[PDB]
Amino acid sequence: YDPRDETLDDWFDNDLSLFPSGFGFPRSVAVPVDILDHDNNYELKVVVPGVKSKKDIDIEYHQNKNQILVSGEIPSTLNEESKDKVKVKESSSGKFKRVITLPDYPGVDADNIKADYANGVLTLTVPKLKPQKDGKNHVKKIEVSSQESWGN
Amino acid sequence: NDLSLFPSGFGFPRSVAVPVDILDHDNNYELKVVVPGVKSKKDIDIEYHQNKNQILVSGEIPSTLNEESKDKVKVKESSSGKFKRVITLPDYPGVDADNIKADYANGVLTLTVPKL
Amino acid sequence: VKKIEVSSQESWGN
Amino acid sequence: YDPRDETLDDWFDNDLSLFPSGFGFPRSVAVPVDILDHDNNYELKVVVPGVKSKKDIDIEYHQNKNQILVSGEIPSTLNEESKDKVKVKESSSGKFKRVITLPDYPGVDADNIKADYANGVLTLTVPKLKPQKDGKNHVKKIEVSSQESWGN
Amino acid sequence: YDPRDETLDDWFDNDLSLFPSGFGFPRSVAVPVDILDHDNNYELKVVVPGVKSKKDIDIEYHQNKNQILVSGEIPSTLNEESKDKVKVKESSSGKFKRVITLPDYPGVDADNIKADYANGVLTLTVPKLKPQKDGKNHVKKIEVSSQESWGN
C-alpha cells in the first residue's frame, strides 16, 4: 500500500482492518467507516465527529450516482463571556460531508435503506437481496471441481 | 469559527493532541473532547485529584480488529488508542472535590467542576 | 424520486 | 517491522504477559531493573550473580531526597590456584548503586522498608501503606452519572 | 583500559593476565561460566541469573557425545492486577541452554557428578579417577630426556 509504515500495521490486536489499496471517498474531514460485507445485508457505520445533534444530519441516497450522501454540521463556538477558554484545538472545519461509493458489487439495494444513530455514531443498516450472481463475472463460476477430494 | 478566537494568556500543560474546547461558563471548568464511538462510559475514567485539586481524564476508543462479519477488500478502519488529558486547575481550595460530574452523551464528553 | 432518512432520538443511553 | 502490537509483543517476549505502564524513571548508570507495581507498594528486583555473604549490600532510605539508598558490590574470583588464569572468562559486577526516584506523593514509609534476599535475587518492597497525603487514603472518586446509561 | 570491566579483566593477573582465549561454548542470555581443570576433579560453577525455581532447572549428561547439558527457563514476571508492569528488561531470552565441550581430557566420569543450587549459583563438581592412564594416551608418556650440560 504505502512504502513502509501503514501497510504492515493493518492486522488485529492494535487498530485497523486489512487494507490493501483503496479508492478515494470525497469528504470533508476523514474518519473511517466499517463495512460488514454480507449478501443478506450491508453495514455502513459513519463515526460522526462528536456532534451533539443528530436531527441536523441528513442521510440520503443518490440513485443517480450509486453513492450514500450524508452531510452534517460539526459543533463550533463563538467568542463570548460565558465561553472563555484556556485551550482550543476543536476540529478544523465547521461542516462535515461524506460521499461514499459502495464497493458492494453490481446488485446494490439501498432504496430500502434504514438508519439508526447509536453511541454518537451514525449507523446505517442497508438491506440487500442482491447480488448472489452477476458480479464481476456474469453468473459465478467459483472453484467447485478438482476431479478429486481436493486434488493431489 | 470551528475553534474560536482566543489569545494565549492562559494555558495548561498537556500531552497528546485531540480536539478540545475548554469552556468556563459561570464558575465551573468544563471541557468538550471529541470521543465518539466509545462503547461504555467506563472505558473513560474521569479522575479528580485529591492531592492537587485538579481534573484528570483518560480514555481509549475501542480498536478495530480483523472481523468475521467483514470481508476485507479495501476498506479503511482506524481509532485512537490510549490518551491522557492533563488539565491543571489553579482554582484553589473552595471548590467541591466530591461534586464533579462528567456527562458523556452523543459522543461528546462534557465535564463540570463545581464550584456551586 | 429522492429518498430521505430521518432516524434520530435514542438519547437514553445503552 | 513497526506493528505497535508486535513491538510490545517483542518487549513481552522478554517478560511474557500483558501490558506495561509508566512511572518514575530517573537513574544515572544502568543496572538491572524490574519495576512492578502492586496496590501502591512498588517492587524492585536487581539480579545479582551470587554474592559472598549478605554483608556486601546496604539498604537504607535517603532522608534528604525522598529516595531509596540501595547499594552493593559483588566480589571477583581472584587468586585462583586450582586453575591458572589463562583460559575461561569470568565477569562479576563491581561497585554498583541503585538510586530509586519515587514521585509517589507523601505517605511513603522509610522504616517499614523490607529487603528480602533469596535465590541470588534482591527483592525490594517499598511501602507505601498510604498513597494520598489527604485524610482519605486510596480514594479517587470518579464519574457516577451522565444522565444516560452510557452515552449516545 | 578505560572500561571498569576491562581494567578488572587486566587485574586478573595473578599468575598471568586473563583475556579471552578465542572460543566460548554456545551462550543464550550472556552470563559467564567458570571451569577449574584438574585430573583429580573438574569443578564447574554455572553462574545462574537468579532463578526462583530449583526444581524446574534440569542437569543431564550425555555419555554418548561426552557433553554436559544444563538447561532451564528464566522465570519472568506477570501482569495481573496486583502486578502492574512498568518497565523490566531481565530475561532477554526465556530459554537458556548450556552445552559445554569439556577441556579436561578424555577419561572424565560425569556419572558421579553432584548438583546443588545455593546462593543463586549452580555448583557442579565432577570427581575424577581417570585421567591418569588410558586418557589421551594409553599409559601416559612424559619426556625425561634432559640434562647433558658440559658443553660440546
Say if CB E58 and CB E70 are below 8 A apart: yes
C7 by Cβ neighbours in 10 Å (0-12 / 13-18 / 19+) ranks as middle
Sign of CA dihedral A14, A20, A21, A27: negative
- Tell me if B64 and A22 make a contact (CB, 8 A cut-off): no
Which residue type occupies B39? Answer: K
Q: List % helix, strand, coil for chain C (3-state, nearest 5).
A: 0, 20, 80
Distance from CA of B51 to the nearest CA of A (A): 22
Size of interface B-D (CB pairs under 8 A): 54
DSSP string, D58-113: EEEEETTTTEEEEEEE-PPP---SSS-TTS-B-----EEEEEEE----S-B-SSS-
Question: The cell 460522526 sits on which residue?
Answer: A48
CATH T-level assignment (fold) for domain B22-62+78-112: Immunoglobulin-like (2.60.40)
**What letter does residue B82 receive in the DSSP assignment?**
E
Distances (CA, A) of E73 to E52, E53, E57: 10, 9, 7
Outline where chain A has alpha helix (H). 5-8
- How many DSSP H helices and E strands does chain C contain? 0, 1
The domain locations on chain D are: 27-77+89-133
Nearest residue in D to E31, CA atom: D91
C-alpha cell at D100: 530509586
Residue B86 Cα to chain centre, angstroms = 9
- Tell me if E88 and D13 make a contact (CB, 8 A cut-off): no
Residues of chain C with C-beta less than 8 angstroms from the C-beta of B105: 11, 13
Q: CA angle, corner A17, sides to A11 and A19, nearest 5?
A: 95
User: What determination technique applies here?
Assistant: cryo-EM
Question: The cell 556419572 sits on which residue?
Answer: E111
Q: How far apart are the first and last CA of chain E?
A: 49
- Asked whether D and B share 3 or more beta-carbon pairs under 8 angstroms, the answer is yes
Nearest residue in B to C10, CA atom: B106
- Tell me if D149 and C12 make a contact (CB, 8 A cut-off): yes
E strand or H helix at D121, and its extent?
Answer: strand D121-126
E strand or H helix at D10, and its extent?
Answer: helix D4-11
CA distance E140 to B82: 73
C-alpha cell at E68: 554436559
Residues of chain D with C-beta less than 8 angstroms from the C-beta of C12: 148-149, 152
Distances (CA, A) of E1 to D74, D86, E8: 21, 19, 9
Residues of chain B with C-beta less than 8 angstroms from the C-beta of C8: none
CA distance E54 to E52: 7
Q: CB within 8 A of D74, min separation 6: which ones?
A: D48, D49, D50, D51, D52, D56, D92, D93, D94, D96
SS3 (DSSP) at B47: strand
Backbone φ/ψ region at D142: left (φ over 0), alpha (ψ -120 to 50), beta: beta
Q: Is the peptide bond before E131 cis (omega within 30 degrees of 0)?
A: yes
Say if CB E44 and CB E61 are below 8 A apart: no
Residues of chain D with C-beta less than 8 angstroms from the C-beta of A118: 152
- Tell me if D143 and B51 make a contact (CB, 8 A cut-off): no
Query: Which A residues 13-32 touch D at CB under 8 Å?
Result: 13-14
CATH T-level assignment (fold) for domain E23-76+91-127: Immunoglobulin-like (2.60.40)
SS3 (DSSP) at D8: helix
CA distance B26 to A83: 9
Sign of CA dihedral E82, E88, E91, E94: positive
CA distance B62 to E105: 64
Q: CB within 8 A of B54, min separation 6: which ones?
A: B48, B87, B88, B89
Which of A15, A74, A88 has its CB closest to that of B63? Answer: A15
Q: How many CB atoms lie within 10 A of CB E57?
A: 19
Which of D133, D142, D150 has its CB closest to that of B51? Answer: D133
**What letter does residue D4 receive in the DSSP assignment?**
H
Residues of chain D with C-beta less than 8 angstroms from the C-beta of E89: 14, 32-34
φ, ψ dihedrals at A131, nearest 5°:
-90, 155
- Count of alpha carbons within 13 angstroms of residue B69, beta-carbon side: 10
Backbone φ/ψ region at D149: left (φ over 0), alpha (ψ -120 to 50), beta: alpha
C-alpha cell at E11: 587485574
Say if CB E115 and CB E122 are below 8 A apart: yes
C-alpha cell at D141: 472518586
- Tell me if B76 and A34 make a contact (CB, 8 A cut-off): no
Q: How many CB atoms lie within 10 A of CB D2?
A: 10
Question: The cell 508486535 sits on which residue?
Answer: D6
Strands laid side by side in the B101-105 sheet: B22-23, B30-34, B108-112, B101-105
Q: CB within 8 A of D20, min separation 6: which ones?
A: D8, D11, E79, E85, E86, E87
Say if CB A90 and CB A100 are below 8 A apart: no
Say if CB A26 and CB A99 are below 8 A apart: yes
- Tell me if C14 and D146 make a contact (CB, 8 A cut-off): no
Say if CB B44 and CB B35 are below 8 A apart: yes
C-alpha cell at A127: 438491506
CA distance B73 to A20: 7
Distance from CA of C6 to the nearest CA of B (A): 17
C-alpha cell at D53: 555473604
- Tell me if D36 and E121 make a contact (CB, 8 A cut-off): no
φ, ψ dihedrals at E17, nearest 5°:
-65, 145
3-class secondary structure per residue, E38-64 = CCCEEEEEEECCCCCCCCCCEEEEECC
| Beta strands B101-105 and E67-73, pairing class | unpaired
Buried b (16+ CB within 10 A) or exposed e, D24-43: eeeeeeeebbbbbbeebebb
CA distance A97 to A57: 10
Residues of chain B with C-beta less than 8 angstroms from the C-beta of D143: 41, 45-46, 101-102, 104
Which of B40, B46, B47 has its CB closest to that of D150? Answer: B40
Q: Minimal CA–CA distance to B62: which of A21, A104, C11, A45?
A: A45
Distances (CA, A) of D55 to D44, D58, D73, E147: 19, 7, 10, 55
Residue E129 Cα to chain centre, angstroms = 20
Say if CB E48 and CB E42 are below 8 A apart: no
- Tell me if D148 and C13 make a contact (CB, 8 A cut-off): yes
Which of D3, D8, D151 has its CB closest to that of A120? Answer: D151
Residue A109 Cα to chain centre, angstroms = 16
Residues counted in chain B = 116
Say if CB A59 and CB C3 are below 8 A apart: no
A126 by Cβ neighbours in 10 Å (0-12 / 13-18 / 19+) ranks as buried
CA distance D132 to B47: 14
Q: How many CB atoms lie within 10 A of CB E128?
A: 19
Considering only CA atoms, give the Rg of chain D. 21
Question: What class has domain D27-77+89-133?
Answer: mainly beta
Does residue D143 belong to the interface with chain C, where contact is any CB pair within 8 Å? no
C-alpha cell at D58: 546496604
| Beta strands D57-62 and E84-88, pairing class | unpaired
Does residue B96 belong to the interface with chain D, where contact is any CB pair within 8 Å? no
Question: The cell 447509536 sits on which residue?
Answer: A118
Question: The cell 468475521 sits on which residue?
Answer: B68
CA distance E119 to D55: 13
Q: CB within 8 A of D133, min separation 6: which ones?
A: B51, D105, D106, D107
Does residue A6 belong to the interface with chain D, where contact is any CB pair within 8 Å? no
Q: CA angle, corner D36, sides to D32 and D37, nearest 5?
A: 150
Question: The cell 461558563 sits on which residue?
Answer: B25
- Tell me if A11 and D1 make a contact (CB, 8 A cut-off): no
Residues of chain A with C-beta less than 8 angstroms from the C-beta of B22: 85-88
Does residue D7 belong to the interface with chain E, where contact is any CB pair within 8 Å? no
Residues counted in chain A = 152
Distance from CA of D141 to the nearest CA of A (A): 25
Q: Is the peptide bond before D130 cis (omega within 30 degrees of 0)?
A: no
User: D25, D83, D100, D117: which to substitute to probe chain E, counting the most E Cβ within 10 Å?
Assistant: D83
Q: Is the peptide bond before A20 cis (omega within 30 degrees of 0)?
A: no
C-alpha cell at B79: 481509532
Q: Which long-range contacts (CB under 8 A, 24 or more apart) does D131-137 make?
A: D131/D40, D131/D104, D131/D105, D131/D107, D132/B50, D132/B51, D132/D105, D132/D107, D133/B51, D133/D105, D133/D106, D133/D107, D134/B50, D134/B51, D136/B50, D137/D107
Nearest residue in C to A114, CA atom: C5
CA distance A50 to E42: 74
Q: Minimal CA–CA distance to E95: which of D32, D123, D13, D120?
A: D13
Q: How far apart are the first and last CA of chain D?
A: 38
Question: What class has domain A26-75+91-141?
Answer: mainly beta
DSSP string, chain E: --SHHHHHHHT--SSS-----S-----SS---EEEEE-SSEEEEEEE----S-SSS-EEEEETTTTEEEEEEEPPPP--SSS-EEEEE---SSSEEEEEEE--S-TT---SS-EEEEETTEEEEEEE-S-SSSSSSSSS----------S--
Nearest residue in C to B104, CA atom: C13
E strand or H helix at D7, and its extent?
Answer: helix D4-11
Say if CB D152 and CB D98 are below 8 A apart: no
Which of B50, B100, B104 has its CB closest to that of D134? Answer: B50
Q: How many CB atoms lie within 10 A of CB B36?
A: 21
